[PDB]
Amino acid sequence: HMSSGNASWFQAIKAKKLNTPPPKFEGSGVPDNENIKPSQQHGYWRRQARFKPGKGGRCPVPDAWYFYYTGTGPAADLNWGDTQDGIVWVAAKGADTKSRSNQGTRDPDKFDQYPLRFSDGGPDGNFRWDFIPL
Structure with missing residues (x-):
């Protein structure tokens, strides 16, 4: 079975190794995005266990974490x-965490992922992400 629908608007951040704590x-930890009202600058990072083909089956790869605006994605049910x-959970200064964006999720058939930028900091050294030009 292949899951489809709620892909993140942004690229993942990736743990450098196995058994890594949350980022x-x-x-703020909220990805750069000029096309969101400051009141709606809040969301969550969600862990996804990753795997790679193995001889004995499929082997664990370090976790990836994906960002979703509050009330969207696999954890849309959460406040x-x-x-x-x-x-x-992450939120910028000026954010009202009760507010809900209509950002929804990304359709990979139509839109490529946004490059991740954190002008105010970023995740700790346990984590990395691929370079994509803006």
């Missing part, structure tokens, strides 16, 4: 701040 952010394993 911590310098600054900002709700406790859930594999969910880290």
Whole structure:
């Protein structure tokens, strides 16, 4: 079965190794995006276990975490701040975490992922992400 629909608007951040704790952010941890009202500058990072083909089956690869605006994505059911394993909540100064964007999710058939930029900091050194030009 192939899951389809709620892909993140942004590229993933990726743990450098196995058994890595959730990302911590310098600054807000909300990805750069000029096309969002400041009131709606809030969301969550969600962990996705990754795998790679193996001889014995498929082998673990370090986790990826994907960003979703609050009330969208695999954890659309959650309110900002709700406790859930594999969910880290983020919000910028000026954000009203009750507000809901219509950003929805990305259709990979129509739109490529946005490059990730954090002008106010970014995730800790446990994490990395691929270079994509703006």
